[PDB]
Amino acid sequence: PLSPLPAVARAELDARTEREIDRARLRRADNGFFRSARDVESVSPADGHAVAVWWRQMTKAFMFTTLAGLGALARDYARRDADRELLGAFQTVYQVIGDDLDNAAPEFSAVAPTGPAGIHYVWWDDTIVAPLAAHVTEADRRAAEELPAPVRELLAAMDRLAAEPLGSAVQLRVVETIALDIAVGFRRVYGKVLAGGEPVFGEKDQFAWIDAHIKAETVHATGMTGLVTDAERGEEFVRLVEEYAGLWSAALECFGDRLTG
Amino acid sequence: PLSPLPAVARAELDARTEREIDRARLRRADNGFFRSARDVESVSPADGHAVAVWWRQMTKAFMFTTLAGLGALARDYARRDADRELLGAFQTVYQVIGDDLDNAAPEFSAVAPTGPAGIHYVWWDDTIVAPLAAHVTEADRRAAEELPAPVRELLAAMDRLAAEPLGSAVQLRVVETIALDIAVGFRRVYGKVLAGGEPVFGEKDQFAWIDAHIKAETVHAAQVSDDETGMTGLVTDAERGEEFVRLVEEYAGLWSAALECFGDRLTG
Ligand SMILES: CC[C@H](C)[C@H](N)C(=O)O
Ligand SMILES: CC[C@H](C)[C@H](N)C(=O)O
Numbered sequence: 001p002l003s004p005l006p007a008v009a010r011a012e013l014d015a016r017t018e019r020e021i022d023r024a025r026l027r028r029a030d031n032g033f034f035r036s037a038r039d040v041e042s043v044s045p046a047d048g049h050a051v052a053v054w055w056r057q058m059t060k061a062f063m064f065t066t067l068a069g070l071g072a073l074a075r076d077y078a079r080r081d082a083d084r085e086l087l088g089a090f091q092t093v094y095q096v097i098g099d100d101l102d103n104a105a106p107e108f109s110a111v112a113p114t115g116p117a118g119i120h121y122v123w124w125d126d127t128i129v130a131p132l133a134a135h136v137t138e139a140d141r142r143a144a145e146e147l148p149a150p151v152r153e154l155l156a157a158m159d160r161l162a163a164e165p166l167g168s169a170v171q172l173r174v175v176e177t178i179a180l181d182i183a184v185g186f187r188r189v190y191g192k193v194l195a196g197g198e199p200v201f202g203e204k205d206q207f208a209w210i211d212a213h214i215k216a217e218t219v220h221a222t223g224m225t226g227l228v229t230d231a232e233r234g235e236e237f238v239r240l241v242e243e244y245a246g247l248w249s250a251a252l253e254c255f256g257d258r259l260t261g
Numbered sequence: 262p263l264s265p266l267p268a269v270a271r272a273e274l275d276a277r278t279e280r281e282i283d284r285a286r287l288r289r290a291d292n293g294f295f296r297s298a299r300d301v302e303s304v305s306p307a308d309g310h311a312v313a314v315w316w317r318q319m320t321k322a323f324m325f326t327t328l329a330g331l332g333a334l335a336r337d338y339a340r341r342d343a344d345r346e347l348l349g350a351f352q353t354v355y356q357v358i359g360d361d362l363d364n365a366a367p368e369f370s371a372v373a374p375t376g377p378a379g380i381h382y383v384w385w386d387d388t389i390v391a392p393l394a395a396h397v398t399e400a401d402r403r404a405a406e407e408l409p410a411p412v413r414e415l416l417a418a419m420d421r422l423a424a425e426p427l428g429s430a431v432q433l434r435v436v437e438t439i440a441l442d443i444a445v446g447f448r449r450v451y452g453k454v455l456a457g458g459e460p461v462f463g464e465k466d467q468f469a470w471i472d473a474h475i476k477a478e479t480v481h482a483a484q485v486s487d488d489e490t491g492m493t494g495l496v497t498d499a500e501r502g503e504e505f506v507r508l509v510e511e512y513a514g515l516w517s518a519a520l521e522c523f524g525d526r527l528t529g
């Protein structure tokens with residue numbers, strides 16, 4: 001009564017989706033955040049702090065709206081009869097959300113704090129934002145929380161995706177493609193923040209959030225297209241990926257702009 | 262700018278909740294399903310299959326609508342800033358209902374099938390429904406999926422709670438308290454199903470779903486009434502607390518009628 005598309009139609013949805021991500025210029029060699037993170041010689045505490053505050057809000061919104069999007073899919077499946085292949089892909093989304101919410105993967109539980117302190121936006125706030133905030137004034141702290149326009153547009157697409165039954169599939173499909181390059185970028189950026197000529201992040205353990213993400217993405221991610229049940233949902237999927245990818249690309253370009261200002 | 266109630270009003274609200282589950286006659290001694298499961302001497306394959314099909318549908322809806330309610334709470338936390346106490350109670354919801362969906366807890370992970378075969382309504386369907394189904398008629402299998410009225414009222418309340426930010430807290434707070442007694446009743450009832458002299462579930466392996474739940478539901482019941490990270494920890498003002506009690510009283514009642522409907526099918 002409710003099945004994925006045959007594997008041939010799905011494979012072409014995957015090729016259309018990867019071409020969407022190419023066209024959005026989200027690849028390692030294309031996007032201005034990755035290039036700036038390699039290129040800049042140093043990063044000021046104020047610039048690093050501001051990017052860290054933006055990322056905190058973006059990662060918080062990614063986690064909660066992806067879960068909300070799984071909620072929307074669950075409302076449908078409560079009354080329909082999803083077959084096992086659909087149920088397996090639904091499970092994958094649940095477990096991938098669980099990394100950011102509860103450090104389900106052993107790569108994260110080995111290093112993350114326990115309880116709510118380990119939620120990834122909170123863990124980022126405690127170990128990346130806070131030491132940077134020690135080195136910016138109160139004025140700059142308030143200014144950093146006035147999010148730039150491309151960041152607000154991304155957050156708003158995420159709220160729209162929180163209601164879609166395909167929304168958690170779109171978000172995970174784009175973010176898990178770019179997560180590794182984002183985390184490596186962060187490792188390069190925060191390795192270059194100096195205050196008074198000394199590194200703000202001087203101890204290895206201070207990078208634990210970032211090093212854990214780099215390792216989890218190097219190793220790991222029933223794919224996301226396994227949640228598409230017909231042809232016209234497939235069109236909807238590709239259309240939503242193109243939009244969401246574009247907004248991620250523009251948000252990441254704002255990080256690169258802030259590091260080269 | 263979003264916090265739980267102080268400890269005293271929270272523990273107060275926990276008392277009214279437990280009194281509503283009392284008044285709804287859901288304790289091991291007050292509900293007719295628990296009585297009848299211990300008291301009946303034998304159960305026919307058709308009656309045991311009917312209850313099994315009903316429970317399949319109820320636990321399917323329970324899982325998916327509690328997940329949907331967690332999504333509705335997540336949508337609100339994406340807009341506001343919840344303090345860490347709220348986020349701890351939120352994690353509990355994700356952890357508890359995540360056992361029905363993927364068997365993370367150790368009691369389930371050792372015995373549950375892997376992948377979608379382990380989703381609890383699927384695992385129930387494969388190991389309880391399907392063996393009973395071999396012993397009833399096609400007409401019996403059709404009739405059993407026409408759910409009784411008290412079961413249909415319960416599902417309709419679940420669908421409403423799927424879109425409430427407190428819905429997952431309501432459903433978990435009630436279902437996780439009575440879950441152990443239901444699993445004990447299932448162990449008694451399906452040990453008593455005879456198909457022409459033969460018991461349909463003779464081997465211990467056949468009770469894997471129920472045995473794991475007898476073990477596991479003791480932890481879950483403690484998880485949802487914990488004073489720091491329990492379900493009332495999701496209530497953020499006094500009026501949300503009243504809406505909570507209102508919704509629990511309703512929800513606990515419909516669970517009673519549906520369960521009493523299980524007992525009647527086993528008796529006369
Ligand atoms: C947007 C999510 C990224 C890739 C990472 N999972 C994090 O916790 O920030
Ligand atoms: C209603 C919940 C029960 C006790 C069990 N968790 C199940 O999967 O059916």
Ligand SMILES: [Fe+2]
Binds near residue numbers: 099100120213
């Ligand atoms: Fe993460």
Ligand SMILES: [Fe+2]
Binds near residue numbers: 096099100176179
């Ligand atoms: Fe991730």
Ligand SMILES: [Fe+2]
Binds near residue numbers: 360361381474
């Ligand atoms: Fe269960």
Ligand SMILES: [Fe+2]
Binds near residue numbers: 360440478
């Ligand atoms: Fe449970």
